[PDB]
Amino acid sequence: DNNFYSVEIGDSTFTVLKRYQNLKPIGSGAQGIVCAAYDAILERNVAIKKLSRPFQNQTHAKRAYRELVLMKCVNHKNIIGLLNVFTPQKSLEEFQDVYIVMELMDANLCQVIQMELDHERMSYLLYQMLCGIKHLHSAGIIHRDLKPSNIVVKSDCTLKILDFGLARTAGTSPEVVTRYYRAPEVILGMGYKENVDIWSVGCIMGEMIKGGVLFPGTDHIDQWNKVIEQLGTPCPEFMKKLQPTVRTYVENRPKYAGYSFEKLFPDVLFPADSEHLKASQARDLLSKMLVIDASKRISVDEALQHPYINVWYDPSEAEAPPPKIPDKQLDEREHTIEEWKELIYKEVMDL
């Protein structure tokens, strides 16, 4: 009706509340499409994600829900804040797309990696990242797909995590997580606990420092090579934990020595060691995150105590009340295209 309008950004069309104008494309990730625009009521910048026919496929709606629900009730400063959800269509009958409005940050990490940062800065950004993640973990939620382009920052040096389309509680035994950031657990057939996110975190930090992608595999298999060439070949106890058929390939892979963290990350790559917050001190944290074996790997809580991160520790920011997930809504129960369409509209319709 008279409350919306439509703009032609590229091929995609944005049918949105009249409140929102001067829209511009910024990104998408892969889970929606995003424009930055000007809220005119509130006279401030926002980000609008469009979700075209989310119900169309079963996976395509799993993500929209996840997102929608999580966005409603998450409450952390290191997580992008929700501003609004809406739909341009008048009732369930003609219902098509959803739009989510949330804060506009200044840029995503991609252009931070190409920077040189001091320890103060970098370690603190990582400390934030951790809190932000910890918040998801404290509800048993796992982000599952942390990456440069899912992390955003502002010029006051603040950081936030976003896109929960893939977020889930723990899983078992179709690769949907992004190649480079895939945990070994994920690469192989294995199930994941939460420290799967710590692997991502390791990948990201390492990247900032490397000024480039850490494990840059050409294909979903090469990506394992990339890991093992680097950090060495898994010890037999890890090898045992594998599915029998893929257990065979991993054993058959060359038995790389894999470089020490000091060669992985030479000093030429770091700035200079102020009041400790050192090359080593970080390197050690890397050396405790990027661990092939998930059970042998550091958790968030621990990552938060680890000296190099610990100097920003704020329990009001660290041990915040966890978000409240409306009761048993996560329970991935696999519904009909029809049931889906309804579920969502009930989450869009709160007013």
Binding site: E120, Y124, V153, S155, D156, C157, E275, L277, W312
Partner: peptide, 10 residues
């Protein structure tokens, strides 16, 4: 240490 308040995004 003071937390940073600053990030050069240009």
């Amino acid at each position: 240490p003071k937390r940073p308040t600053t990030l050069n995004l240009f």
